[PDB]
Amino acid sequence: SSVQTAATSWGTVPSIRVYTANNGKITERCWDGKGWYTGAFNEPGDNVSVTSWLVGSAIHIRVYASTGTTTTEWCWDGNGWTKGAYTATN
Amino acid sequence: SSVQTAATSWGTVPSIRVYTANNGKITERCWDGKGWYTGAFNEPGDNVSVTSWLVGSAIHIRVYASTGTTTTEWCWDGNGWTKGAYTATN
Amino acid sequence: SSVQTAATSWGTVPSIRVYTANNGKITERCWDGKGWYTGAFNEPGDNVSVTSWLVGSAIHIRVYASTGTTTTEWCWDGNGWTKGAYTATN
Numbered sequence A, B, C: 001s002s003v004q005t006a007a008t009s010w011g012t013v014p015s016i017r018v019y020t021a022n023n024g025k026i027t028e029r030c031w032d033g034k035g036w037y038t039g040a041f042n043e044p045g046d047n048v049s050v051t052s053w054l055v056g057s058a059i060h061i062r063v064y065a066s067t068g069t070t071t072t073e074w075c076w077d078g079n080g081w082t083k084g085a086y087t088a089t090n
């Protein structure tokens, strides 16, 4: 019905990422202290969750995008978004 | 049908905040080690996400509240809740 | 019928937990740096959120599981999942 969001943040600036699932597409908005901008994340899904962790100053993000019973993990490790090994039996 | 929640926590006590979206209104329950109480956050939304970060011992919280395609950011930085600069274009 | 997910992570290995609400049941998938495996968490809910915090190297997790207007908190504190004191009046 309404759009569905997930958010994560890191450091003390801070950096924030907000994922929005909207009519079966998930997009990303980004804050690194200098204003909101559109991020590179673009994947299909009706539902989104996210978690992230720092290794020093390098951010690692995992976005979990679901359509039906299939959840697909997407990984940011500094070098673009790549499909992760996550599987489930839903 | 069911209500929809988002949660964040910080420190080692810990402090926890649970946001619940219910029939278009989001409310807040709080734990700081001494029992659950109703927090000050009260905003419209059908969907809620949240993230938080520490700057030293000072907590900062961002709650993302959505109704239809409009997501509104709310900010706690120690001194009450204020509308954030987040915009999307959904 | 789309599933709904929540995620948390900790440390820098990292450890990740992904909770999936699916036809009124919430299940758990786990990563601690080897493969993905099925976790012990199994509770009723149409909606799930989660937060976690470290006390030293010991993980503490709180999962908020909602069915209708009733949100139930589940606690991992290193030995097993136990019902938490969380209440709300939804």
Ligand SMILES: CO[C@@H]1O[C@@H](C)[C@@H](O)[C@@H](O)[C@@H]1O
Pocket (backbone or CB within 6 Å): A017, A028, A030, A038, A039, A040, A041, A059, A061, A076
């Ligand atoms: C630098 O690129 C921005 O930040 C990264 C951590 C990701 O969230 C990416 O999609 C976004 O466009």
Ligand SMILES: CO[C@@H]1O[C@@H](C)[C@@H](O)[C@@H](O)[C@@H]1O
Pocket (backbone or CB within 6 Å): A062, A073, A075, A083, A084, A085, A086, C013, C014, C016, C031
């Ligand atoms: C190195 O493996 C990648 O990162 C791990 C933290 C997990 O998210 C895994 O599913 C992913 O493919």
Ligand SMILES: CO[C@@H]1O[C@@H](C)[C@@H](O)[C@@H](O)[C@@H]1O
Pocket (backbone or CB within 6 Å): B017, B028, B030, B038, B039, B040, B041, B059, B076
């Ligand atoms: C001190 O006030 C309590 O904690 C703050 C961090 C906020 O979550 C606020 O809504 C709540 O009432």
Ligand SMILES: CO[C@@H]1O[C@@H](C)[C@@H](O)[C@@H](O)[C@@H]1O
Pocket (backbone or CB within 6 Å): A013, A014, A016, A031, B062, B073, B075, B083, B084, B085, B086
């Ligand atoms: C300083 O700006 C405020 O805090 C930032 C971390 C962002 O959440 C932004 O939208 C908000 O207006």
Ligand SMILES: CO[C@@H]1O[C@@H](C)[C@@H](O)[C@@H](O)[C@@H]1O
Pocket (backbone or CB within 6 Å): C017, C028, C030, C038, C039, C040, C041, C059, C076
């Ligand atoms: C050791 O047990 C595994 O990890 C714990 C932190 C919990 O996530 C539990 O459900 C899971 O099976």
Ligand SMILES: CO[C@@H]1O[C@@H](C)[C@@H](O)[C@@H](O)[C@@H]1O
Pocket (backbone or CB within 6 Å): B013, B014, B016, B031, C062, C073, C075, C083, C084, C085, C086
């Ligand atoms: C010790 O109390 C347990 O842990 C706290 C951090 C809260 O989650 C509370 O609801 C729970 O019963």
